[PDB]
A paper describes a structure:
shown to play a key role in the MHC class I assembly pathway. cellular processes with broad patho-physiological implications. GSG linker and the C-terminal residues 369–417 were deleted. The long C-terminal α3 helix is kinked at Thr346.
to two different crystal forms in our study. yielded similar structures, except for their N-terminal extension.
Residue numbers in the entry: 16 to 202, 304 to 367
Amino acid sequence: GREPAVYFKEQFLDGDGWTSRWIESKHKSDFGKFVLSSGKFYGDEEKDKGLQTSQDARFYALSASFEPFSNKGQTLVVQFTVKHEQNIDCGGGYVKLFPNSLDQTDMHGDSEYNIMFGPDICGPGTKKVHVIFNYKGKNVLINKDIRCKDDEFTHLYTLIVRPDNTYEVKIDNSQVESGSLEDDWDFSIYAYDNFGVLGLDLWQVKSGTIFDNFLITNDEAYAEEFGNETWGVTKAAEKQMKDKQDEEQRL
Ligand SMILES: [Ca+2]
């Protein structure tokens, strides 16, 4: 049978239909709720709908399952958009890729995972992109400092992992970091037997972040193409709308 290039895609285009694809963890009874919204300003009111954190000072735990796969002998790409529309003080904006053994109804901050990737902000001192590989019972952190975006607009985050043990990180479809797994972490290191769930495990103080346009693919050129069709289409119209609102607030 024909092998797919896309393992997972989520754009939230079918209204409340997303609730059949994403599971809320019940690990705690006080997790915050994600709501479907395109927010105060956006590129397109319908296309720019995504998952938005709705409660301040709260832990979040929501995840989506997909047909399990292995990245052995292939490239792996994880990509999504993050929009901290609230002008965030402190909060996570990263994803985790888990093996199929994860119980989605029990997912939490300390559940075992394979890879963690994305922006984390906590005051001026923490504006970073995490790139964590689980290896031989340790969650190994990248030894390179990658600065994340901190404004109110939609930004595209991309992690590419290749079978030659090389990686690349992109922000807004432009390279920000690259190198070898052997050099940039203190460890087939690239390869995982099973990926089955993508999860949002976050802590936020000022809530309101919107997540959209998730993609997991073995095709790095396609991730760039989809990036331009999503974040690339949102960008200019979103900036025009916020500039217009700031002009209304000014007066
Ligand atoms: Ca969307």
